[PDB]
Amino acid sequence: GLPSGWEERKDAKGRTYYVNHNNRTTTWTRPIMQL
């Protein structure tokens, strides 16, 4: 489940994160924008 409007990167350092262009954010949190 990925929301169109952020890019995501699942890094093997044991943490995946989503970047929102709409709010300018880098976060572990699952995007609510998605619904």
Binding site: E7, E8, R9, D11, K13, G14, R15, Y17, V19, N20, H21, R24, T25, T26, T27, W28
Partner: peptide, 12 residues
């Protein structure tokens, strides 16, 4: 957990 990489820099 060591935190997030800076915002909007995405190597694809």
């Amino acid at each position: 957990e060591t935190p997030p990489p800076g915002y909007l820099s995405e190597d694809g």
